Structure 1
Amino acid sequence: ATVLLEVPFSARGDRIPDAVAELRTREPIRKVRTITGAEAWLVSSYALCTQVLEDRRFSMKETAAAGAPRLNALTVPPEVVNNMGNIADAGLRKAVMKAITPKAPGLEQFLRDTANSLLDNLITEGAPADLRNDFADPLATALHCKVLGIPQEDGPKLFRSLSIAFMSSADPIPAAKINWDRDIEYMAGILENPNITTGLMGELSRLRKDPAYSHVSDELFATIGVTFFGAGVISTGSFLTTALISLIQRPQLRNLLHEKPELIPAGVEELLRINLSFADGLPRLATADIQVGDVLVRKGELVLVLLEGANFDPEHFPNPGSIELDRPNPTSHLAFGRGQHFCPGSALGRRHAQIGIEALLKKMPGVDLAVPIDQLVWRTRFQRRIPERLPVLW
């Protein structure tokens, strides 16, 4: 006798498990057990993943309902699971989007200057260098302080909440509440700080005093700052880190992008497609009985949309494990999701990775791992797959 298949399969972000293609072929929707002990439906084909993400009856908000089967414990208040819905209901979606575009004057130059400064410091210090802790994550942090309009010196402490805030735990996490409440207090102070007049927080600060937003809660305004900092920093830092591994393990591609940097955007789109940064499927709770492939999902059941299931599906992306810069459907991957909850920071995430990679290839054309790849230490029970350190030489 064996127990029901458990998720996630592996915390490693450098290889996709063979089990993914086996499930996709044999049972592209099948029952699994999550870390909390709940059962869920794991969806692993492109066709079924998109079906779920495109049907709002598979609800993100309802995953926070008391008594629901859970993928993991909440690390935020339950209402914050509906964060984007709350922002939209407050009439703030357009303003938040506009504030997080990479097209803001001087923003791309700031990303370039910051990436170049971080790389120059690594070169001065000498190999080995840690590309996660001393490149990708500080670049993500600096970017988000700039986008938010908050002091660069405040970034490191906000960043240190993230190793806990983005845990994927079976049980509630006491430290997550301590950090959440403290970070909310910080953002509430930013809204009242007369010096904060730029970026997302400067815009929220002004809208907060505009009569057309007088009944939007101060709780929501502070929550937008904490959540966009956290989601953006963890997602960009983690994606860039693991994309650097994907690139370092593909020296022919690395050489091609070094030689022809105009191919970097197409390269980043493929690095997004093959990315294993999301450690768990995207969760949704069924609000009705809905047929998904051979399974009638019942109201109240949990569904997990496995992004690498979709993104490595050979029926949608032939030769899925290969980075091919001339695919006919290059942006049709699910790295930023699909449907109602499509990533609001997608353009900024793409630009962060493009500039980070462009700068690294110019500064360190000979970049390579400084340890055998198996020696990377993959963070466990986390919402992202990331190596704890990424030691390189050049």
Structure 2
Amino acid sequence: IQTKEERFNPFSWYEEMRNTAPVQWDEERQVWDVFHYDGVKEVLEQKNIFSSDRRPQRQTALGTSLINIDPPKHAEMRALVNKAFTPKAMKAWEPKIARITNELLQEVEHLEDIDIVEHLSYPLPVMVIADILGVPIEDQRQFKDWSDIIVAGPSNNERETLEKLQQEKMKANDELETYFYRIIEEKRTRPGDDIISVLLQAKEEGKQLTDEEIVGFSILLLIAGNETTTNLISNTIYCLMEDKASFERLKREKELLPSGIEEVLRYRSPVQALHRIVKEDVTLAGKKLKAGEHVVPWMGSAHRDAEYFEDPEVFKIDRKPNVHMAFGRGIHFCLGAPLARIEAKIMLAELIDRYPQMDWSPSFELKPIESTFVYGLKELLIRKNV
């Protein structure tokens, strides 16, 4: 067993491992775990040693996307989309984000008790991402189900359990792919002000990319639009409700909201760990990793490392410095980080401004997402207390 509460609070385990053997082979899971900050940093910076190429027996469109390719192909692909996602590119989206936020809040103005997740932190980012891709938000419910399947972790360690899930992932990949091949066809005919059109335009003009590659990137963004920022927002609310002294201070000092969001990214990171494959034999903190072995750098553990974060187990909305790796580190550093920060800020500032006396509803229950790829809650019932 591990109860819900232990699953959502892995930090005692991380600490134990950090202070004994921060690099260690786990026989059961067949991976090298990496728990200390310097190890996580080294694994993620050393792109030519710790590969992001995840080989399966048929590769997917997702397997050709940015997150799963090594240099020199990675730099070429990322080059085609970088300009579209800079901080300054994304400041253009602020007034859109603020309107979606207000529209969502208006829709539940009549409820005294609301689910932060279902009504606010989940819809806002998929509505943004559907506008960015140029796909219809009327398909939101398919998007969510496909995306939850893809990031889903198994309920047990049994094999008829894992193999059923693998199957359900392959089926979701297929349907996602065929969805986006249709979209592509539609856009070749009727382009729009979206990034699928923009990549088709770059393709017609002779940039080196396949239609499968456009599908793969579109899927990556879709899943990102369903499965990351939602948890940053919800987890922030969770942290502020857990520690009311932080919440009371934030309300007095609004300018601390960005710093507080960075301290959620550290303290309750939406992504706890990543995966790499050893390309060639390497020693990492005195351990000898072999070609072809898998490695799991735990950013969630690194973020609690005392050598880099004074009083690590303490949530400090004003924490400085805060050099966390919640978006990764190195060439695969999250493309969406500017968007995620601005979505989170705008939504959280408005929530806090409207409901300063908010607290857990009598119906609240801790329900962690069953996933190793994402870290968050499935629901978060709050009472407004107006």
TM-score tier after normalising by the smaller chain length: 0.7 to 0.9
Aligned to 1:47: 38
User: 2:266 and 2:41 mapped to 1: Cα distance?
Assistant: 15
Aligned to 2:348: 357
249-258 or 85-94, which deviates more: 85-94
11-20 or 179-188, which deviates more: 11-20
Aligned to 1:97: 82
User: 1:315 and 1:173 mapped to 2: Cα distance?
Assistant: 39
Contact 2:282 2:289 in 1 (8 A): yes
Match of 1:23 among 17, 33, 39: 17
Change (3 A) 1:196 1:135: farther
Structure 1 residues 33-112: aligned runs within 5 Å: 33=27, 37-64=28-55, 78-80=63-65, 83=68, 85=70, 88=73, 91-101=76-86, 103-104=88-89, 106-112=92-98
**C-alpha distance after superposition, 1:342-368 (max 9, x if no partner):** 111111111111111111111222221
SS of aligned partner of 2:350: helix
Structure 1 residues 267-282: aligned runs within 5 Å: 267-279=260-272, 281-282=273-274
Contact 1:115 1:135 in 2 (8 A): yes
Match of 1:344 among 335, 341, 349: 335
Aligned to 1:69: none
SS of aligned partner of 2:109: helix
Shift of 1:38: 4.2
Structure 1 residues 1-394: aligned runs within 5 Å: 14-33=8-27, 37-64=28-55, 78-80=63-65, 83=68, 85=70, 88=73, 91-101=76-86, 103-104=88-89, 106-124=92-110, 126-169=111-154, 170-171=162-163, 173-193=166-186, 194-210=189-205, 212-213=206-207, 216-279=209-272, 281-330=273-322, 332-371=323-362, 375-394=365-384
Change (3 A) 1:247 1:277: same
170-179 or 312-321, which deviates more: 170-179
Contact 1:275 1:335 in 2 (8 A): no
Shift of 1:195: 4.1
Contact 1:282 1:306 in 2 (8 A): yes
Letter in 2 for 1:299: A
**C-alpha distance after superposition, 1:125-156 (max 9, x if no partner):** x1221111111110111111122233332333
Change (3 A) 1:297 1:91: closer
Shift of 1:9: 10
SS of aligned partner of 1:64: coil
Change (3 A) 1:76 1:32: farther
TM-score by length of 1: 0.85
Identity %: 23
Shift of 1:78: 4.5
User: 1:178 and 1:326 mapped to 2: Cα distance?
Assistant: 45
Contact 2:52 2:275 in 1 (8 A): no
User: 2:114 and 2:3 mapped to 1: Cα distance?
Assistant: 30
User: 2:231 and 2:7 mapped to 1: Cα distance?
Assistant: 10
TM-score by length of 2: 0.86
Change (3 A) 1:254 1:191: same
User: 2:11 and 2:376 mapped to 1: Cα distance?
Assistant: 16
154-163 or 107-116, which deviates more: 154-163
Change (3 A) 1:270 1:291: same
382-391 or 221-230, which deviates more: 382-391
Shift of 1:46: 0.8
User: 1:86 and 1:145 mapped to 2: Cα distance?
Assistant: 29
**Which runs of 5 or more residues in structure 2 are unaligned?**
155-161
User: 1:244 and 1:106 mapped to 2: Cα distance?
Assistant: 26
User: 1:304 and 1:100 mapped to 2: Cα distance?
Assistant: 27
Change (3 A) 1:271 1:393: same
Letter in 1 for 2:352: L
Letter in 2 for 1:204: L
378-387 or 82-91, which deviates more: 82-91
Corresponding residue pairs, total: 372
127-136 or 316-325, which deviates more: 316-325
Contact 2:37 2:303 in 1 (8 A): yes
Contact 1:162 1:230 in 2 (8 A): yes
**C-alpha distance after superposition, 1:186-243 (max 9, x if no partner):** 2222223244411212312322322x22x52111111111111112431111222222
Change (3 A) 1:38 1:260: closer
Contact 2:52 2:69 in 1 (8 A): no
SS of aligned partner of 1:31: strand
Aligned to 1:70: none
User: 1:224 and 1:95 mapped to 2: Cα distance?
Assistant: 11
Change (3 A) 1:350 1:88: farther
Letter in 1 for 2:146: S
RMSD: 2.8
